[PDB]
């Protein structure tokens, strides 16, 4: 099929509507650039990898390189792998990047490099040198970089790559850099503004630094500029999740009023970890197109019940006052100026962590009328009442996010306390308008606690303390709700009604109710699922369901069922057949995973007991010990079959005769140590097999027609026990000249022996001494 | 050290005080008896092998066996491994057993034989035939039992092992045999009392069968018998966990009101799931040594209130009325009637599953005056309303159970729900007054909760819905309490005053309290362990812990800390200083866990930060990929070190050298493929090692110099990949010869190759081709 294998241990692909020849070698444990790279290559990628110099020899042919990738070869010692450190930094000899004629990216972060990189072609668009030493930048360094258009040069010195002194900008550094758009300075040990800056910029990235103070022409020349980014300059320091240095005498950055003038194109400014406590209406008066404003980690609790800057702000989309609370206050209510009224055009306000015991209908007032409104987030405030009925005023909105707070009768987990949000590394919101409140202190639930919500679609419940029996009258106002999540509660199924008023729900997800189902002899209702007539998909994940008043589930609409994480070991012992048709009466059921569920067994009658419509069937996880691969012929729709972490040891005798259905087949993770002769024989449906992390020693061609392989989509291999002796001549062959599709053939398909090949990768081995 | 090294495939042990010289093969994957069993063997055990037949060579030599153990060669199907099948019953061949003189007892449970094995020698006292498939007991086949003592022969037929017919006992079957004095016919679907039985029985298992009628003299003549268990015929069969027929038309086990006027002696008498609607005075009339009596899951709701049979049984020790709840009912309160005052012995008495929704304290005063009361257990009653101060007047009790219920403002977890809790296969309590309040619905505590409690030594709050900040107001009465269980909650430790009323209290735990230790940028504070004075044990896992306000905790106490299941690998994230001293002022810490942390490295300062008395720790199931073994330098009182399930591939050169002080060195479960040349020179403190499950192919003398192995308690080395070439000589023959302990030398110290050799155990190896 092919007439030359690859030997490059590099994904190379082709996209010639982009004229590009990209070489992906991420990763692939090299310590010398690879032999024999295409020519035309474009795109070469070499991140993470171990190769400790370049030379004019590195990328000597590859005339046509638009980007070089050469990220972390050498990252700082706190950055990077202690089992692996670096033993030292990255060796640029001259003249290596001068002859790339075409070159318009290059990337250099995480080397330690002491300085930038000379020599560099006048193409040159883009310069990353993030997470390097270089902590002095002079103006005569910067001449190459003419026509440079975006300049990234953070992260060389901070906590966690430090350089010990301030960074030093020589005056007008970068004035004559005409054509610079992007500027990024971040985490820096930076002290002052740098000036002056060209005026093409449109995004400066300044945050995390020591500048103590604006000052008022700082920015005079940035007409251009639409995103500047100050944060984390005096920053507030209370539960700060990295080492925290706040500015003396709690200083905030002092900001001149009328520093801001010169930014008329500004669309984002941040101002996040500043120490704040007034936010003058002056900064704005000539910034007219703000769109996003981020005032989160400051001490602005006090400014939010006043804040006249916000009618100076029509446009504005998105803002962000999280986190802005009192030291050991805990305010009775959220103060909220009624300037916010002024802001028209919002669509995002999210007001976390300003901290208080109660909120009302009126203290939202001022956000009646902002009629482009979609999020309200007022999560993280320890809010211990709320009547969910003010949102009577809100059907308007996508979400109203009440997530952790202490109420009873999608950012990042970590976001708002990170370090660097944007550091570089080397739902049911589709449903409509959603009520977030999970992991709050709900106990107890009544229908009334939910009137005037008919609007509602999804209702996020999950991580509250609910340990009640429904009957279906708790939920009776939410008419439209399509998604209900009620995970990590304590549900008690006593009766098979409940849910049942939720006339419209699609998605109902009770994972995490375990409590009741762990106590002895108690009843459980699994059959409630028959009055929910448009249910489409049930989730009871991790309930540790071994026992159940009712034999059969039964659902007309469900097509969707994860029960991962139960005893149907428990309820399937050998012996005991009242729930060996659990599923059967979900008609119209098309995915059932009953992975980690313990069945080192199936007894017969599981798979005559599924419904007739199974298509995607996992049983991963289970401990499998033995698997009688005939009785698939029961399940006749069967298309996706997850076997993967379990312990077989054979395949069917003849796949065909077990299935003809068949399309994917999992078996990742096993014990299986042979295939059977015939194994693939007249499989034609196949089209997606894993057989990885197995001891296979050999597979003969028998097992494999290639009238099946020809089919396949992709053939998972990696991580088995290839003997390469010249028995495994065929297999060895076919590899390397094969078209499908086979992950890790660089780095992980490879001989465990006889001696001389051991650790030798299968497409690399030549096996002439068979043919003498 | 020794000249004939043991090659016999079991473990042997000398007991010269009894002359027992035991050989246990359990489990060794037999499929012939082994061969060279010593001549003087008493006790002779071949559990779970796969020795398919019985024959006069099998014992032949073995002259003095008291014992032989022989079960579960052939287990029937429903029981046993469905991997590894039992292809075809054991085989019995005669003459078998009539050798030996001394046989005293012959265990062969579950072999699927088909009838009493016939010529058994009449030293015989024990016979067990347990699940088998022996359903029709005749006297011809018994003759040969005359000296029996002890006969077990149920579960011959029932759902895990069915019969499809009624068990089947002719007249008068054990009428001869005169020294019977325990017969258990258990699961065997009897459908009457067999009769006439032997006098001299002590010990009657009926239970778990057919029988629906007790004769008024079907026990007759038993004045010496001790224990009746009739329990499971009529069963109550809602929500059971095994398939389960009850009696026709809800009938129970109709017993006569006269037939146990002969039981004089009995002292326990089992009644459980036998439909009881009415417990007859007169049952009792005759029997005044009742000891235990169980009466769980019947239908005595309603005699539970009135119960005049309680007035024939003060002498009663235990009394269980579980799970006699009426059917879809849920009452107010429980109804005790005062007969209860009239057992004056009673220790133990057990109602759950009564269930109520209230508890008050004039519905215990029945229980007043009973001085010996001990265990009063009211779990699983989903009583929602109880007001704790009432146990003022049970000051008494050990323990008071009320776990499992619904209140708001040791027996398996298996156990009145199981088919056959004494089925066979082949805490805080010691602290003094415990209130088990676990698995509740308690979200909020008050000091008044616990008015009049200052007696209680234990409270379990395990597993309620407390999400709540304590500032040491909430438990001021427990001013006794020694340990606080909180686990499972969602404690806020906004105070550092959280607990310190609790002035006695030696053990907390405040594990699985991770919800707000999950929320980013909340306060912790850790440093709540200075205030409590007396603490010894702190367990606070799996709370996900990753920021802390507090720095450093503190104890002058405290000697125990459990830290596993949290992120200290986010708090000593590189870089980050702030947190290398966090329990480096527990000054009288002695054993720290720190496994599951996710510390793939341990940043430097963390050794140096560890306390100074710190004498166990665990560094387990980290991911640790390196490890700088001269650190432990530090760590100057280290006596254990458990670095199990981690990703080591590397020893150090001298563990001397390292560590004066290790004992014990625990490297289970890592990536070691070699041991340094010098290993264990001169590591005089070393006393267990545990190299077990890692990637050794040789060992050489240099690593072990052998005046340190000889003072080694245990080294363990099973499990790895060792090469069993010429080269490997020396330790081949040091395995062979030596005195030290070395688990699993017959079963899993096995060499890996050269091909000849491969899955040979080392101990049964012959390398004189080596020395020719
Ligand atoms: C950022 O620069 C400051 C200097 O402005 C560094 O502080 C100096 O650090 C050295 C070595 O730690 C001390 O001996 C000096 O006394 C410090 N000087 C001053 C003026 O504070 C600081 O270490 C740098 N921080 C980072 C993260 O690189
Ligand atoms: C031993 C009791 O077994 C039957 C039973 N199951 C439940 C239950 N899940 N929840 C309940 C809630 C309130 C009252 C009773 C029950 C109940 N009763
Ligand atoms: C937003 C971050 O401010 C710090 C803070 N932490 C907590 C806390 N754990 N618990 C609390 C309980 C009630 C009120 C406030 C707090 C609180 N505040
Ligand atoms: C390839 O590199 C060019 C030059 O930097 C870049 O603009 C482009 O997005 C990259 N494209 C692909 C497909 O890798
Ligand atoms: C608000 O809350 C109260 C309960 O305190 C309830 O009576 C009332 O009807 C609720 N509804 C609205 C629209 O606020
Ligand atoms: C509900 O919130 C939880 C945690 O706050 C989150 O994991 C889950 O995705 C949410 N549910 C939906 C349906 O998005
Ligand atoms: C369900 O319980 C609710 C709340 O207790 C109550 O309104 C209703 O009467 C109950 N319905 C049924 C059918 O029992
Ligand atoms: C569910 O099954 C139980 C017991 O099997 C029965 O009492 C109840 O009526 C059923 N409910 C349904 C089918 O909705
Ligand atoms: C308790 O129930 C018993 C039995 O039905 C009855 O004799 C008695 O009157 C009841 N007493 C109380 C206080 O409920
Ligand atoms: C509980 O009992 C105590 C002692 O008699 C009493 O003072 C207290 O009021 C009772 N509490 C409640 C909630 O009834
Ligand atoms: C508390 O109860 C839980 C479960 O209810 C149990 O796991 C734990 O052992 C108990 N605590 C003590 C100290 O016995
Ligand atoms: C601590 O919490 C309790 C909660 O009721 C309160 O009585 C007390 O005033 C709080 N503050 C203290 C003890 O300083
Ligand atoms: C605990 O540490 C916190 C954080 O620094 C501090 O505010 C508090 O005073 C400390 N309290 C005690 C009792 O050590
Ligand atoms: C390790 O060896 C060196 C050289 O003999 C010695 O000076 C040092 O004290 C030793 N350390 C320990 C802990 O034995």
Chains 1, 2 share one sequence.
Not at 555 to 581: I, K, M, P
Request: aromatic fraction near 10%.
């Amino acid at each position: 099929a092919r007439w030359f294998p690859k030997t490059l241990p590099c994904d190379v692909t082709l996209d010639v509507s982009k004229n590009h020849v990209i070489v992906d070698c991420t990763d692939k444990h090299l310590t010398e650039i690879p032999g024999g790279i295409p020519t035309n290559t474009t795109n070469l990628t070499l991140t993470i990898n171990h190769i400790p110099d370049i030379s004019p020899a590195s990328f000597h042919r590859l005339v046509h390189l638009v980007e070089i990738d050469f990220r972390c070869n050498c990252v700082p010692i706190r950055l990077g792998s202690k089992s692996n450190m670096c033993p030292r930094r990255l060796q640029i000899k001259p003249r290596s990047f001068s002859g790339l004629t075409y070159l318009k990216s290059l990337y250099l972060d995480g080397n330690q490099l002491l300085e930038i990189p000379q020599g560099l072609p006048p193409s040159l668009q883009l310069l990353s040198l993030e997470a390097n030493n270089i902590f002095s930048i002079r103006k005569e360094q910067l001449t190459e970089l003419a026509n440079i258009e975006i300049l990234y040069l953070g992260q060389n010195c901070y906590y966690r790559n430090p350089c010990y002194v301030s960074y030093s900008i020589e005056k007008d550094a970068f004035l004559n850099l005409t054509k610079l758009k992007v500027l990024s300075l971040k985490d820096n040990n930076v002290t002052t503004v740098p000036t002056v800056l060209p005026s093409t910029l449109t995004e400066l990235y300044l945050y995390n630094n020591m500048i103590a103070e604006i000052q008022e022409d700082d920015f005079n020349n940035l007409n251009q500029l639409q995103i500047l980014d100050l944060s984390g300059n005096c920053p507030r320091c209370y539960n700060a999740p990295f080492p925290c240095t706040p500015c003396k005498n709690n200083s905030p950055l002092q900001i001149p009023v009328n520093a801001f003038d010169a930014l008329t194109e500004l669309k984002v400014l941040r101002l996040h970890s500043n120490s704040l406590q007034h936010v003058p209406p002056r900064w704005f008066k000539n910034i007219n197109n703000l769109q996003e404003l981020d005032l989160s980690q400051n001490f602005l609790a006090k400014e939010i019940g006043d804040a006249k800057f916000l009618h100076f702000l029509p446009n504005l989309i998105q803002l962000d006052l999280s986190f802005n609370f009192e030291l050991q206050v805990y305010r009775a209510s959220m103060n909220l100026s009624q300037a916010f009224s002024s802001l028209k055009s919002l669509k995002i306000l999210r007001i976390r962590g300003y901290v208080f015991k109660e909120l009302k209908s009126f203290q939202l007032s001022p956000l009646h009328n902002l009629q482009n409104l979609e999020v309200l987030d007022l999560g993280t405030n320890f809010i211990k009442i709320a009547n969910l009925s003010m949102f009577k005023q809100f059907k308007r909105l996508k979400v109203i996010d009440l997530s952790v707070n202490k109420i009873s009768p999608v950012l990042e987990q970590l976001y708002y306390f990170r370090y660097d949000k944007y550091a570089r590394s080397c739902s049911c919101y589709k449903y409509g308008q959603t009520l977030d409140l999970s992991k709050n202190s709900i106990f107890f639930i009544k229908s009334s606690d939910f009137q005037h919500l008919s609007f509602l679609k999804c209702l996020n419940l999950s991580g509250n303390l609910i340990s009640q029996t429904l009957n279906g009258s708790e939920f009776q106002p939410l008419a439209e709700l399509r998604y209900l999540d009620f995970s990590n509660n304590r549900l008690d199924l006593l009766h098979s009604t409940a849910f049942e008023e939720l006339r419209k729900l699609e998605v109902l997800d009770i994972s995490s109710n375990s409590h009741y189902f762990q106590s002895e002899g108690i009843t459980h209702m699994l059959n409630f699922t028959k009055n929910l007539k448009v249910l489409q998909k049930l989730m009871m994940n991790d309930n540790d369901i071994s026992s159940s008043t009712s034999r059969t589930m039964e659902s007309e609409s469900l097509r969707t069922l994860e029960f991962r994480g139960n005893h149907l070991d428990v309820l399937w012992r050998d012996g005991d057949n009242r729930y060996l048709q659990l599923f059967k009466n979900l008609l119209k059921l098309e995915e059932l995973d009953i992975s980690k569920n313990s069945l080192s067994f199936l007894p017969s009658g599981v798979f005559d007991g599924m419904p007739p419509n199974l298509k995607n069937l996992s049983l991963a996880k289970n401990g499998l010990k033995s698997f009688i691969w005939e009785k698939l012929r029961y399940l006749k729709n069967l298309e996706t079959l997850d076997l993967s972490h379990n312990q077989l040891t054979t395949v069917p005798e003849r796949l065909s005769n077990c299935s003809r259905s068949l399309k994917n087949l999992i078996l990742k993770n096993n014990q299986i140590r042979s295939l059977t002769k015939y194994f693939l024989q007249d499989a034609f449906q196949l089209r997606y097999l894993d057989l990885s992390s197995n001891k296979i020693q050999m597979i003969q061609k028998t097992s494999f027609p290639e009238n099946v392989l020809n089919n396949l989509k992709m053939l998972l291999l990696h991580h088995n026990r290839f003997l390469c002796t010249c028995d495994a001549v065929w297999f060895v062959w076919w590899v390397q000249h094969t078209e499908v599709t086979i992950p890790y053939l660089a780095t992980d398909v490879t001989c465990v022996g006889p001696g001389a090949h051991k650790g030798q990768s299968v497409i690399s081995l030549d096996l002439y001494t068979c043919e003498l």
